[PDB]
Amino acid sequence: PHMMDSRDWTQLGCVAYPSPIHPDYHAGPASTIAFDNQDELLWIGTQKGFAGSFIGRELKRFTAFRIHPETDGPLRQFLFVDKGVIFLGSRSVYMAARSGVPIWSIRHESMQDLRAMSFTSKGTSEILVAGWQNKMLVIDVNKGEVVKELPTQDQYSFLKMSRYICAATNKGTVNILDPITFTIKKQWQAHGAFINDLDTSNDFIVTCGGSHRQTHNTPAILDPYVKVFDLKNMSAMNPVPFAPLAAHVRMHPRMLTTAIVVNQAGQIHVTDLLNPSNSQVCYTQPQGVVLHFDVSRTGEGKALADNKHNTYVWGSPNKIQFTE
Ligand SMILES: [Cl-]
């Protein structure tokens, strides 16, 4: 295939978060990471709900604040809108400006163990919120309040809006939901037992996962494929091979049919989903096991968090831009 060149691929930045001095350090590594839509921010969460933002490729520390009571557990997910950042915990949803100025706070009784959120049919004005529970909630982002509760038989681990709401259950199944009614349009059996990551563009769903969930005596086993679904034609595609075992995946923002696939050793494949033999390979050599991954809006910045509490940014040594 092709091996990527070092003139286009180098470690641009690294930060320890939470670092040994941090109060949440004892609770573990980063719980989630996400590039902002603006201001060249990368956001990182802790296992106790601290949020930190970091500027540019060198990840200069910017803002930092806790978004829910420590006892609520890990920061679950970020979402970004013009006015600020939405913060998801298991028992609440918090919104504040990027500077940390509070905007609203929702602590609803049906918020018992939330795990994921996504936008819906109303742009950035409305989000859907779900988790390992039998209820989902719809929230007006503008007014900062719950608008409706929805029952659900399937519990969810990932949510993302593209053409529809792509909803990974906690059983390796993907439900595709109508963005307005939230009813299940189609169910896609992506992996055997669990989904480890999901992303989606208007044309594709891509997932990583495996056939054996982690147990008390056995470690989790990831599949040697990225699974692919056609949103346009609403039908599954042939699995894209990934020998290093696919742990995380992101659709490339500016290459329509291309996905960025990462294994736990930090090995990355940039692969055309329609032509798998065409794929660039590159390595990042993280200190620990990679747990989370994201790509910036421009596609120029790649971020990876490991279980040694490091978060790295990779990209071209030339001038880079997270958001354009
Ligand atoms: Cl720190």
Short mmCIF file of C-alpha atoms and ligand atoms in Angstrom, two decimals:
data_model
loop_
_atom_site.label_atom_id
_atom_site.label_comp_id
_atom_site.label_asym_id
_atom_site.label_seq_id
_atom_site.Cartn_x
_atom_site.Cartn_y
_atom_site.Cartn_z
CA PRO A 1 0.00 0.00 0.00
CA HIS A 2 1.84 3.08 1.29
CA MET A 3 3.89 4.23 4.30
CA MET A 4 3.37 7.89 5.25
CA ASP A 5 6.35 10.27 5.30
CA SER A 6 7.90 11.95 8.36
CA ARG A 7 7.81 15.30 6.56
CA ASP A 8 4.02 15.17 6.96
CA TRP A 9 3.73 13.31 10.27
CA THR A 10 5.24 14.28 13.63
CA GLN A 11 4.30 14.68 17.29
CA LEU A 12 3.33 18.35 17.59
CA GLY A 13 2.27 18.45 21.23
CA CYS A 14 1.72 16.48 24.41
CA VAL A 15 0.08 17.17 27.75
CA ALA A 16 -0.42 15.11 30.89
CA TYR A 17 -4.03 15.37 32.00
CA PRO A 18 -4.91 14.69 34.68
CA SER A 19 -1.26 15.02 35.76
CA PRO A 20 0.10 13.70 39.11
CA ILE A 21 -0.63 17.05 40.82
CA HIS A 22 -4.28 16.93 39.74
CA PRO A 23 -6.98 15.89 42.28
CA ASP A 24 -8.53 13.43 39.79
CA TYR A 25 -5.21 11.80 38.93
CA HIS A 26 -5.92 8.88 41.26
CA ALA A 27 -9.18 8.17 39.44
CA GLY A 28 -7.49 7.37 36.13
CA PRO A 29 -6.62 8.71 32.65
CA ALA A 30 -8.67 10.93 30.31
CA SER A 31 -12.33 9.91 30.09
CA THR A 32 -12.89 11.52 26.68
CA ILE A 33 -11.31 13.97 24.21
CA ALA A 34 -12.76 16.20 21.50
CA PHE A 35 -11.57 18.97 19.21
CA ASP A 36 -13.65 22.13 19.53
CA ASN A 37 -15.40 23.73 16.54
CA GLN A 38 -13.47 26.94 17.16
CA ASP A 39 -10.69 28.79 18.98
CA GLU A 40 -8.22 25.96 18.27
CA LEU A 41 -9.26 24.12 21.42
CA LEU A 42 -8.88 20.49 22.36
CA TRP A 43 -11.08 19.47 25.30
CA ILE A 44 -10.14 16.70 27.73
CA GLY A 45 -12.23 15.25 30.56
CA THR A 46 -11.31 13.35 33.73
CA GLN A 47 -12.86 10.35 35.51
CA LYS A 48 -14.36 12.70 38.10
CA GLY A 49 -15.79 15.29 35.75
CA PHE A 50 -13.05 17.86 35.40
CA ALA A 51 -12.91 19.62 32.04
CA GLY A 52 -9.75 21.13 30.61
CA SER A 53 -9.19 22.98 27.34
CA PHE A 54 -5.87 23.25 25.48
CA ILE A 55 -4.84 25.69 22.74
CA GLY A 56 -3.27 24.81 19.40
CA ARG A 57 -0.90 22.04 18.34
CA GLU A 58 1.29 22.47 21.44
CA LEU A 59 -1.77 22.10 23.70
CA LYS A 60 -1.25 25.20 25.85
CA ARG A 61 -3.41 24.96 28.97
CA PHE A 62 -6.36 27.36 28.78
CA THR A 63 -9.48 26.89 30.89
CA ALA A 64 -10.17 24.25 33.53
CA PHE A 65 -13.20 23.61 35.75
CA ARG A 66 -15.34 20.79 37.12
CA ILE A 67 -18.72 20.37 35.45
CA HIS A 68 -20.57 18.17 37.97
CA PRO A 69 -20.15 16.77 41.50
CA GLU A 70 -17.14 14.41 41.75
CA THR A 71 -19.50 11.59 42.75
CA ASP A 72 -21.22 11.74 39.34
CA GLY A 73 -18.13 10.10 37.84
CA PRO A 74 -16.40 10.54 34.47
CA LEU A 75 -16.99 13.37 32.03
CA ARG A 76 -18.81 11.41 29.32
CA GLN A 77 -18.78 13.60 26.21
CA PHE A 78 -18.37 17.09 24.76
CA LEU A 79 -20.51 18.87 22.15
CA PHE A 80 -19.78 22.29 20.66
CA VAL A 81 -22.03 25.15 19.59
CA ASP A 82 -21.50 28.85 18.86
CA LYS A 83 -22.37 30.03 22.38
CA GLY A 84 -20.35 27.44 24.27
CA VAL A 85 -19.64 23.84 25.21
CA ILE A 86 -22.11 21.21 26.36
CA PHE A 87 -20.82 18.85 29.07
CA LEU A 88 -22.35 15.43 29.68
CA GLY A 89 -22.16 13.52 32.95
CA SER A 90 -24.10 10.42 33.98
CA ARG A 91 -26.56 12.41 36.08
CA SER A 92 -26.58 15.89 34.56
CA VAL A 93 -25.89 18.08 31.54
CA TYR A 94 -23.91 21.29 31.87
CA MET A 95 -23.34 24.16 29.47
CA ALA A 96 -20.78 26.94 29.84
CA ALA A 97 -18.88 29.34 27.61
CA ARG A 98 -15.39 28.22 26.60
CA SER A 99 -14.09 30.76 29.14
CA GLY A 100 -15.93 28.88 31.89
CA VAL A 101 -18.76 31.38 32.32
CA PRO A 102 -21.87 29.30 33.21
CA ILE A 103 -24.79 29.20 30.78
CA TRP A 104 -27.13 26.54 32.13
CA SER A 105 -27.29 23.40 34.25
CA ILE A 106 -29.75 20.52 34.05
CA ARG A 107 -30.11 17.84 36.71
CA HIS A 108 -33.22 15.87 35.80
CA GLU A 109 -34.55 12.92 37.82
CA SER A 110 -34.52 10.60 34.78
CA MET A 111 -30.80 11.28 34.33
CA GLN A 112 -29.52 8.14 36.06
CA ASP A 113 -26.59 6.91 33.95
CA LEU A 114 -26.17 9.00 30.80
CA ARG A 115 -23.39 7.97 28.42
CA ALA A 116 -23.93 9.81 25.13
CA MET A 117 -25.51 12.81 23.46
CA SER A 118 -25.97 14.12 19.93
CA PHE A 119 -27.64 16.90 18.00
CA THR A 120 -30.98 16.19 16.31
CA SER A 121 -33.04 17.65 13.45
CA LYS A 122 -32.78 21.21 14.76
CA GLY A 123 -29.13 22.03 14.12
CA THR A 124 -27.41 23.10 17.32
CA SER A 125 -30.65 24.11 19.07
CA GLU A 126 -31.60 20.66 20.36
CA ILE A 127 -29.78 17.61 21.72
CA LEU A 128 -30.70 14.01 22.45
CA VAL A 129 -29.37 12.47 25.63
CA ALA A 130 -29.12 8.77 26.51
CA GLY A 131 -27.14 6.11 28.37
CA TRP A 132 -27.31 2.81 30.21
CA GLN A 133 -30.93 3.36 31.20
CA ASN A 134 -34.41 2.85 29.76
CA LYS A 135 -35.16 6.53 29.17
CA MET A 136 -33.83 9.16 26.77
CA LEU A 137 -34.24 12.92 27.07
CA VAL A 138 -34.56 15.76 24.59
CA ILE A 139 -33.12 19.12 25.59
CA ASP A 140 -33.64 22.63 24.21
CA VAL A 141 -30.09 24.02 24.04
CA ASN A 142 -31.35 27.62 23.81
CA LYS A 143 -33.67 27.57 26.84
CA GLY A 144 -31.55 25.09 28.78
CA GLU A 145 -34.33 22.70 29.72
CA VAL A 146 -35.72 19.22 29.18
CA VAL A 147 -38.41 19.19 26.49
CA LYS A 148 -39.48 15.54 26.50
CA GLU A 149 -38.66 12.08 27.86
CA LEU A 150 -38.57 9.01 25.61
CA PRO A 151 -38.74 5.34 26.56
CA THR A 152 -36.11 3.04 25.07
CA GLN A 153 -35.63 -0.72 25.15
CA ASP A 154 -32.06 -0.44 23.87
CA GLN A 155 -29.43 1.24 26.06
CA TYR A 156 -26.80 3.37 24.30
CA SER A 157 -23.04 3.97 24.48
CA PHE A 158 -22.54 6.36 21.54
CA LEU A 159 -24.69 8.92 19.72
CA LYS A 160 -23.99 11.07 16.67
CA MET A 161 -26.13 13.02 14.21
CA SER A 162 -25.26 13.10 10.52
CA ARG A 163 -28.02 12.27 8.04
CA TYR A 164 -29.80 10.44 10.86
CA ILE A 165 -28.97 9.83 14.51
CA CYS A 166 -26.56 6.90 14.62
CA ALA A 167 -26.95 5.17 17.95
CA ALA A 168 -24.57 2.48 19.20
CA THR A 169 -26.16 0.27 21.86
CA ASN A 170 -24.19 -1.36 24.66
CA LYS A 171 -24.55 -4.73 22.89
CA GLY A 172 -22.66 -4.12 19.64
CA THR A 173 -25.79 -3.15 17.75
CA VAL A 174 -26.35 0.17 15.94
CA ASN A 175 -29.84 1.66 15.81
CA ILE A 176 -30.46 4.33 13.18
CA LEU A 177 -32.98 6.82 14.55
CA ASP A 178 -35.25 9.32 12.86
CA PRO A 179 -33.93 12.76 13.89
CA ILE A 180 -37.48 14.04 14.56
CA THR A 181 -39.48 11.15 16.04
CA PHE A 182 -36.46 9.22 17.41
CA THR A 183 -38.01 5.92 16.29
CA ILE A 184 -35.75 3.16 14.97
CA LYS A 185 -35.53 3.31 11.16
CA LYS A 186 -33.18 0.36 10.89
CA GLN A 187 -31.05 -1.84 13.12
CA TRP A 188 -27.51 -2.77 12.08
CA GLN A 189 -25.69 -5.64 13.81
CA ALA A 190 -22.18 -4.22 13.55
CA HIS A 191 -20.17 -6.28 16.03
CA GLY A 192 -20.72 -9.41 18.10
CA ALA A 193 -20.74 -8.05 21.65
CA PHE A 194 -19.76 -4.37 21.90
CA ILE A 195 -18.95 -1.17 20.03
CA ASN A 196 -15.71 0.57 20.99
CA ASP A 197 -16.08 3.67 18.83
CA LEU A 198 -18.49 5.11 16.29
CA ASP A 199 -18.34 7.92 13.79
CA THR A 200 -20.52 8.97 10.89
CA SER A 201 -20.71 11.32 7.94
CA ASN A 202 -23.77 12.02 5.77
CA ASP A 203 -22.92 8.94 3.69
CA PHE A 204 -21.36 6.44 6.10
CA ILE A 205 -21.36 4.93 9.56
CA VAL A 206 -18.08 3.47 10.78
CA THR A 207 -17.59 1.44 13.96
CA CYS A 208 -14.90 -0.34 15.94
CA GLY A 209 -15.81 -3.15 18.28
CA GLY A 210 -15.41 -6.78 19.19
CA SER A 211 -16.93 -10.16 19.94
CA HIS A 212 -15.93 -10.39 23.60
CA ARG A 213 -16.65 -7.74 26.23
CA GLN A 214 -14.17 -7.32 29.08
CA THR A 215 -14.94 -9.60 32.01
CA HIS A 216 -13.44 -9.98 35.48
CA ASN A 217 -10.97 -12.62 34.27
CA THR A 218 -10.69 -11.83 30.56
CA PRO A 219 -9.64 -8.70 28.62
CA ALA A 220 -11.71 -7.17 25.79
CA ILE A 221 -11.08 -8.48 22.27
CA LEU A 222 -11.27 -6.05 19.34
CA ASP A 223 -12.11 -7.09 15.78
CA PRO A 224 -9.57 -6.99 12.92
CA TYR A 225 -12.09 -4.91 10.94
CA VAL A 226 -13.76 -1.55 10.82
CA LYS A 227 -17.46 -2.11 10.11
CA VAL A 228 -19.11 0.14 7.52
CA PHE A 229 -22.73 1.09 6.78
CA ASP A 230 -24.22 3.02 3.84
CA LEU A 231 -26.47 5.79 5.14
CA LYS A 232 -27.44 6.86 1.62
CA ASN A 233 -28.71 3.42 0.56
CA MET A 234 -29.40 2.22 4.12
CA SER A 235 -27.49 -1.05 3.82
CA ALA A 236 -24.38 -2.59 5.39
CA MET A 237 -21.08 -2.73 3.50
CA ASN A 238 -18.17 -5.14 3.45
CA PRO A 239 -15.96 -4.89 6.56
CA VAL A 240 -12.72 -2.99 5.94
CA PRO A 241 -9.74 -5.11 7.05
CA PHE A 242 -7.54 -3.75 9.81
CA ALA A 243 -5.05 -6.35 11.01
CA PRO A 244 -3.72 -4.27 13.95
CA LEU A 245 -7.26 -4.54 15.46
CA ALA A 246 -9.46 -1.45 15.15
CA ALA A 247 -9.97 0.44 18.41
CA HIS A 248 -10.95 3.91 17.28
CA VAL A 249 -12.13 5.50 14.04
CA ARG A 250 -13.02 8.91 12.63
CA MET A 251 -14.33 9.84 9.19
CA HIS A 252 -11.90 12.16 7.45
CA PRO A 253 -13.57 15.62 7.27
CA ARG A 254 -12.38 16.49 3.75
CA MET A 255 -12.01 13.06 2.14
CA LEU A 256 -15.59 11.85 1.53
CA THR A 257 -14.98 8.07 1.58
CA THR A 258 -11.91 7.92 3.82
CA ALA A 259 -11.64 6.83 7.45
CA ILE A 260 -8.87 7.27 10.00
CA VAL A 261 -8.43 4.02 11.95
CA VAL A 262 -6.35 3.64 15.14
CA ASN A 263 -5.25 0.60 17.14
CA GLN A 264 -4.28 0.48 20.83
CA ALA A 265 -0.56 0.66 20.04
CA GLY A 266 -1.15 3.97 18.28
CA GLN A 267 -0.81 2.59 14.75
CA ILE A 268 -2.94 4.65 12.35
CA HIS A 269 -4.35 3.79 8.92
CA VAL A 270 -5.79 6.45 6.63
CA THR A 271 -7.97 4.25 4.43
CA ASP A 272 -10.40 4.65 1.54
CA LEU A 273 -13.48 2.68 2.60
CA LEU A 274 -14.20 1.98 -1.07
CA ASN A 275 -10.59 0.99 -1.88
CA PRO A 276 -9.01 -0.59 1.25
CA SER A 277 -5.76 -1.44 -0.58
CA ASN A 278 -5.23 2.32 -0.84
CA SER A 279 -4.19 3.25 2.69
CA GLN A 280 -1.43 5.30 4.31
CA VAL A 281 0.17 3.80 7.41
CA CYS A 282 1.80 5.80 10.21
CA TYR A 283 2.85 5.26 13.83
CA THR A 284 2.64 7.48 16.92
CA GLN A 285 4.31 5.43 19.67
CA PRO A 286 2.25 6.51 22.71
CA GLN A 287 3.67 5.78 26.17
CA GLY A 288 0.59 3.73 27.03
CA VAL A 289 -2.50 2.12 25.54
CA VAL A 290 -4.60 4.47 23.38
CA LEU A 291 -8.07 4.98 24.88
CA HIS A 292 -9.51 7.87 22.88
CA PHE A 293 -9.03 9.55 19.54
CA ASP A 294 -10.38 12.49 17.57
CA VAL A 295 -9.69 14.49 14.41
CA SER A 296 -10.05 18.27 14.00
CA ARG A 297 -12.60 19.91 11.67
CA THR A 298 -9.91 20.54 9.07
CA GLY A 299 -8.53 17.02 9.32
CA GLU A 300 -5.07 18.48 9.93
CA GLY A 301 -4.87 17.66 13.64
CA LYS A 302 -5.02 14.16 15.12
CA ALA A 303 -5.37 13.68 18.89
CA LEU A 304 -4.77 10.54 20.99
CA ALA A 305 -5.12 9.95 24.73
CA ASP A 306 -3.43 6.97 26.41
CA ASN A 307 -3.88 5.17 29.72
CA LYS A 308 -0.67 6.76 31.02
CA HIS A 309 -2.61 10.07 31.12
CA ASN A 310 -0.89 11.57 28.06
CA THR A 311 -2.75 13.28 25.24
CA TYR A 312 -0.83 13.81 22.00
CA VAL A 313 -1.48 15.92 18.92
CA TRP A 314 -0.08 14.66 15.62
CA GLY A 315 0.07 16.25 12.20
CA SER A 316 2.25 18.01 9.65
CA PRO A 317 5.32 19.86 11.02
CA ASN A 318 4.18 22.74 8.81
CA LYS A 319 1.60 25.29 9.95
CA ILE A 320 -1.50 23.46 11.12
CA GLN A 321 -5.09 24.56 11.80
CA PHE A 322 -7.68 22.74 13.93
CA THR A 323 -10.62 24.81 12.72
CA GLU A 324 -11.02 26.86 9.54
CL CL B 1 -3.07 18.54 35.47
#
